[PDB]
Design a protein around this nucleic acid. Structure first.
Ligand SMILES: [Mg+2]
Ligand SMILES: [Mg+2]
Ligand SMILES: [Mg+2]
Ligand SMILES: [Mg+2]
Ligand SMILES: [Mg+2]
Ligand SMILES: [Mg+2]
Ligand SMILES: [Mg+2]
Ligand SMILES: [Mg+2]
Ligand SMILES: [Mg+2]
Ligand SMILES: [Mg+2]
Ligand SMILES: [Mg+2]
Ligand SMILES: [Mg+2]
Ligand SMILES: [Mg+2]
Ligand SMILES: [Mg+2]
Ligand SMILES: [Mg+2]
Ligand SMILES: [Mg+2]
Lengths: 215, 126, 192, 113, 63, 177
RNA sequence: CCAAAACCAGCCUCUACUGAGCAAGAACGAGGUCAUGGUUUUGGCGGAAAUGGGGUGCCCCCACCCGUCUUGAAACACGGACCAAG
RNA sequence: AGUAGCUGGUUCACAUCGAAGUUUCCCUCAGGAUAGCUGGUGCUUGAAAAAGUAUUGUGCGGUAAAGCUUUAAAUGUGCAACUUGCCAAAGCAAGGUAUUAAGGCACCAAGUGGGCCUUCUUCGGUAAGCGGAGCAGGCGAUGCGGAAUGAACCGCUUAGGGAUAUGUGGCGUCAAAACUUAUGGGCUCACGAACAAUGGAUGACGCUCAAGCCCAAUUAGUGCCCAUUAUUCCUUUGGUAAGGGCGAGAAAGUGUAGCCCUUCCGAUGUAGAUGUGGCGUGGAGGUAAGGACGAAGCUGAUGGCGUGAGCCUCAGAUGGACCAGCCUCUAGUGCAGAUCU
């Protein structure tokens, strides 16, 4: 009886995950075509388009845990950047932009592409479950973690940690911070800022490349 | 080698320039019910009941009002603990806090980017 | 390669097995370990952990203090509701100061010969955790209680006496030895 | 397939005839071995624990179980594919004749039959 | 020698424990006495009406 | 190699406010490795010139600029730079290259060697293509003549990597490695 | 027992926009691999073989005498020839 | 057996955590006591009184700069999110109907109380590898990888291993890698490559269209190498972690040869604390067993087992008569070091 009701649910969930990610695919294709029209409108209008600011950065701890000061050392813990190539998505509040500004030599970050978000959540994605670090494998796994009619798909997660979400904290917090491998082909200098020809600090959209070699 | 009660207060208890003088009537007519937040900003013109020094500028709640004095509970970090101090204070040395004025305003009220059509636009070169 | 700062400090120290050599505690832990795991009841989870405690931390209760806490509990019970079983994970001791007590239904590890006789003189049952499990497998209207431990004379010694806030009891074979003039003494009271 | 096949020998047992090869944890701030410089001898630790379902298993594939007399053999009658009796060193060649023609009749293995 | 080195580290090991909550050791005692004494007169009357209230609830509960 | 420095034009403004309701937009040509540095150098000039800062502004366009073509030509790069040894040398060197980006990056390597000057000490001040004659500098003037022929003298011709060899027979090109 | 090949799984590697470029997205195809999992197959070896251990030598590589007090020991600081019993 | 705040020594393993060289006091300054740091034991309950972090709001400040002893930073810092007095009186007063994260409390107790270096800030000193402080980080107590070498520099911090990928550093040989790569730019002829006297030191050689310097690069106008690091895999151990289960096995279990399986996180470590169906010794109460077909002891390219202390077996062409196991009890109980006897 329950044995099959587990089927009615597992079938109903992909019916939902299908329905969800069909919307998210449309909500991407549409949102970006709309964001192309405007910047394209404006070029016709001899006119600039102030693109909406990033509302999510994929912060990545990039120096190791030795010799770090008590203020940086706390901010990294609150970012949950406790190891080297840990990663988290943190949305760019002023209060966060002032946390990130406090530990930039310890982190590389930028504004993840939707693809960067997919790869981390699908490949490197791990839910916290009963404190266990649990590899994402089922959408069943996700709906149980997130008791939230909003958050069912792994596509629900990627939208939250990309669109900026109303559950961006509800989602990203239920994820273990990402444990990325060191960037293939290496860094540049974990000591200099990115614009110095180094590695640390905000590197805008370029983080997707750097973070792609890692994932 | 010489830490008496007012060591190193040459600047701390100084009156501001052209702002010397004993506290006015607005001071004297302020009133402190217990549990009020306050600022123990010591005023040099009044010497009786002056706060130590650590307590200068500290905020705390009144726990006590005597006729000329406001008892104030002010946390002090002693070591691994914040001991919770009870300075006694003449009311001149206590400026009532606005530390919660925002939050009281809240429960008072509880009761992207687009095309920029701008046309002036100088070149930025040196 | 991990910040661990503040992780070890959050480690808790709990008993996970009884130090008691007593066989019956172990058959009794055998029960409620099971019963605590196999039932959803929070009562079995309390009887099971308390049962794992030190005899220090399993303080005895006065039958006087059960009769008080029980009638105080039962007096409000709507008519036709029989009173809760008075479970304690500890000994139950007779109290001379309360000669007559209500037909209590106490349940405890151990009873004084005085408590057991007064308990049955009132007609109350003096049942063990064995049939507690058989009558209330779940903590269904059990009234789990603890004996006192603040009045324990060991804790009268906690802290210093000489420290101004304190009313710790100094350690002394000689009561008159550390007696002192009223003038010389620590201030009694002091705000925290 | 064992982690380490070598003994964890005491440091500098090789120079001092009196020292047994048996392990003592090094002490002294300046001990090269407890400061665990890379060219030095290793110290035992939990990480060299053998795999736990192959543990205690002799290359015969049996766990040895001590045996002293013919009655012990029946302690291995029903688990004769798991335990192998190793007859104690001090049972007589007399008694071992008896353990052995009986450890044969029962299909129980013996390490030193 | 008087270096204060390793002290804030040694102090933040068990954190700076934050100060006790206002609802705890809220003894008056050395409070301006005349208020303090009138407070006793009220608190004692709160007790007689608290007990008198529970006596009411039981008599009400005999129904 | 392709030029060291891409040609960005970063456009941006101090973000609108009741203080400045309709702020000036600022175009700013940069020669940067990549836009994140071009965006950076752009905010460097915004505070060093307009007193507006990165927190308070907003780049409106990071886009790279298309090359004029590919014909060999002639660039007057105007390059201020800094050192402890020299605190601000204005200096219009000319370079011969196929692109503004190439002339400029060429001006950084030139400037980094004759002056131990890092990228962020330097700031380009403009990169006009120049006609043949305007180049006062005598070095690139040698290359103007429509009839210029020169030898590729004393070449080191390394083999294509696939064909390189450690040992070879002496009057042969039999490999022996 | 040693090998080798295969299969499956795993795993890994190897358009869009823009004005030719990107800050840009997948696909097809193929490879690698058991110090990955499961599926055998096929050969080689079989008084000896085989795996493991042990011993001795070498090779390449790594490697400052220990105990000690000390901020700091390889110290040109102290104690230290061997072993047994204590 | 005088006493010694001093010197020297203080004997098994493993696992779990792990300091301090500072506060006050002391005829105290080579020592105590005290508090902090640490361990153990809990207790209590589970975003309680969470925060070496911001934001926002509200205080505080008088250092740098300025200025000619005054305005004023940044880094900081606090805080917040009916009955009974007064009044003239019944109204006032008082008590009553962003991110992250398990919080707090108690008890007992150790070591420690010579620190050192460095960062930045300073003070003293002509200067110092100098005395003194502030801040933080380190070494101490810690390797590993790198800087040829180095306690504290750099990177990274550490269970036993493999793949992958890196970090600092490199890629002519030494030396892994540019089999001396670039289809890159300049510069350079004589030296050149982070922190006066034994002959000789870019580490050595050597290099010179560099194997040097500045710059940029990555196969080219169409990269590679090396970590105790990361990731992943296997195994171990710990978790007072999360679950499921109850041909041979299926034990209701802290701990063993773990009841079984599953998943997750952790693992360094001096002083020190603690654990251990942890090791081992002489003896005792028990149990069980062994021995003249050879006990103990001793010998051992005797293997086997255990992370280990160790146990076991084999063989003695050793011995000659005692004795291992297991649970409980006990102690004159474990030795390379005492200028030890
Ligand atoms: Mg590098
Ligand atoms: Mg650094
Ligand atoms: Mg002042
Ligand atoms: Mg009492
Ligand atoms: Mg001292
Ligand atoms: Mg010395
Ligand atoms: Mg540790
Ligand atoms: Mg000494
Ligand atoms: Mg001044
Ligand atoms: Mg000045
Ligand atoms: Mg090195
Ligand atoms: Mg080589
Ligand atoms: Mg350890
Ligand atoms: Mg004896
Ligand atoms: Mg030998
Ligand atoms: Mg002895």
């Amino acid at each position: 009886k329950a044995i099959a009701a587990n089927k009615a649910a597992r079938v109903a969930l992909k019916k939902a995950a299908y329905a969800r990610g069909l919307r998210y695919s449309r909500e991407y294709r549409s949102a970006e075509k709309k964001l192309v029209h405007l910047r394209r409108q404006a070029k016709s209008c001899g006119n600039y388009y102030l693109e909406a600011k990033p509302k999510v950065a994929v912060v990545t701890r990039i120096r190791g845990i030795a010799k770090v000061a008590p203020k940086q050392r706390k901010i990294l813990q609150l970012l949950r950047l406790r190891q080297i190539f840990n990663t988290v998505f943190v949305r760019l509040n002023k209060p966060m932009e002032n946390m990130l500004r406090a530990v930039e030599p310890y982190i590389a970050y930028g504004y993840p592409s939707l693809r960067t978000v997919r790869m981390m959540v699908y490949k490197r994605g791990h839910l916290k479950i009963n404190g266990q670090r649990v590899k994402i494998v089922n959408n069943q796994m996700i709906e149980s973690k997130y008791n939230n009619e909003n958050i069912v798909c792994a596509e629900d997660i990627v939208n939250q940690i990309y669109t900026g979400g109303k559950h961006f904290r509800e989602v990203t917090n239920g994820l273990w911070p990402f444990k990325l491998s060191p960037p293939a082909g290496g860094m540049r200098q974990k000591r200099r800022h990115f614009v110095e020809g180094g590695d640390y600090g905000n590197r805008d959209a370029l983080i997707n490349r750097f973070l792609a070699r890692m994932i | 080698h010489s830490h008496g009660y007012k060591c190193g207060t040459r600047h701390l208890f100084a009156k501001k320039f052209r702002k010397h003088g004993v506290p006015s009537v607005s001071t004297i007519l302020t009133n402190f019910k217990v549990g009020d937040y306050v600022d123990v900003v010591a005023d040099s013109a009044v010497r009786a009941g002056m706060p130590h020094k650590y307590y200068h500028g500290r905020t705390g709640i009144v726990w006590n009002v005597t006729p000329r004095g406001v008892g104030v509970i002010v946390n002090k970090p002693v070591r691994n603990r914040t001991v919770r101090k009870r300075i006694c204070v003449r009311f001149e040395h206590v400026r009532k806090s606005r530390c919660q004025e925002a939050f009281k305003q809240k429960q008072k009220d509880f009761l992207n980017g687009g095309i920029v059509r701008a046309k002036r636009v100088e070149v930025l070169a040196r | 390669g991990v910040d661990l700062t503040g992780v070890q400090k959050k480690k808790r120290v709990v008993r996970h097995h009884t130090y008691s050599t007593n066989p019956y505690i172990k058959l009794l832990i055998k029960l409620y370990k099971f019963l605590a795991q196999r039932t959803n009841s929070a009562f079995n989870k309390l009887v099971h952990q308390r049962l794992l405690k030190s005899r220090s931390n399993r303080a005895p209760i006065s039958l006087s203090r059960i009769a008080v806490c029980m009638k105080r509990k039962s007096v409000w019970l709507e008519k036709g509701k029989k009173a809760p079983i008075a479970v304690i994970v500890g000994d139950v001791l007779d109290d001379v100061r309360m000669a007559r007590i209500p037909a209590l239904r106490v349940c405890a590890l151990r009873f004084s010969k005085s408590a057991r006789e007064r308990i049955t003189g009132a007609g109350g049952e003096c049942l063990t955790f064995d049939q507690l499990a058989m009558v209330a497998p779940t903590g269904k209207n059990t009234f789990l209680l603890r004996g006192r431990k603040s009045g324990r004379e060991s804790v009268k010694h906690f802290g210093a006496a000489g420290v101004p806030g304190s009313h710790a009891k100094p350690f002394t074979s000689n009561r008159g030895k550390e007696r002192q003039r009223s003038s010389a003494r620590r201030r009694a009271f002091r705000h925290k | 397939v064992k982690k380490r096949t070598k003994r964890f020998t005491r440091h500098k047992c090789e120079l001092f005839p009196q020292l047994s090869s048996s392990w003592r944890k090094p002490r002294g701030e300046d001990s090269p071995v407890r400061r665990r410089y890379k060219g030095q001898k290793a110290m035992p630790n939990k990480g060299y624990g053998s795999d736990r379902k192959t543990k205690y298993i002799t290359p015969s594939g049996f766990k040895n179980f001590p045996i002293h007399n013919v009655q012990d053999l029946y302690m291995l009658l029903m688990q004769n594919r798991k335990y192998a009796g190793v007859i104690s060193h001090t049972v007589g060649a007399k008694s071992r004749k008896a353990i052995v023609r009986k450890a044969h009749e029962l299909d129980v293995r013996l390490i030193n039959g | 020698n008087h270096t204060n080195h390793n002290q804030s580290r040694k102090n933040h090991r068990n954190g700076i424990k934050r100060a006790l909550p206002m609802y705890l050791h809220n003894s008056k005692r050395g409070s301006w006495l005349p208020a303090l004494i009138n407070a006793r007169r009220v608190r004692k009357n709160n007790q007689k009406a608290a007990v008198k209230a529970r006596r009411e609830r039981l008599a009400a509960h005999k129904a | 190699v392709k030029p060291h420095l891409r040609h960005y034009c970063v456009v941006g403004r101090e973000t609108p406010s009741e203080k400045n309701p309709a702020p000036t937009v600022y175009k700013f040509e940069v020669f940067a490795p990549n836009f994140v540095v071009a965006k950076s150098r752009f905010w460097r000039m915004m505070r060093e010139k307009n007193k507006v800062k990165s927190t308070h502004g907003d780049v409106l366009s990071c886009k790279v600029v298309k090359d004029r073509k590919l014909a060999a030509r002639n660039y007057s790069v105007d390059i201020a730079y800094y050192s402890q040894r020299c605190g601000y040398t204005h200096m219009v060197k000319e370079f011969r290259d196929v692109s503004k980006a190439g002339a400029v990056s060429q001006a950084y390597h030139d400037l980094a060697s004759r002056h131990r000057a890092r990228y962020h000490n330097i700031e380009v001040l403009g990169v006009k293509s120049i006609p043949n004659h305007q180049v006062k500098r005598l070095s690139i003037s040698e290359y103007h003549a429509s009839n210029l022929s020169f030898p590729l003298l004393h070449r080191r011709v390394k083999a294509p990597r696939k064909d390189r060899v450690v040992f070879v027979k002496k009057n042969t090109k039999r490999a022996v490695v």
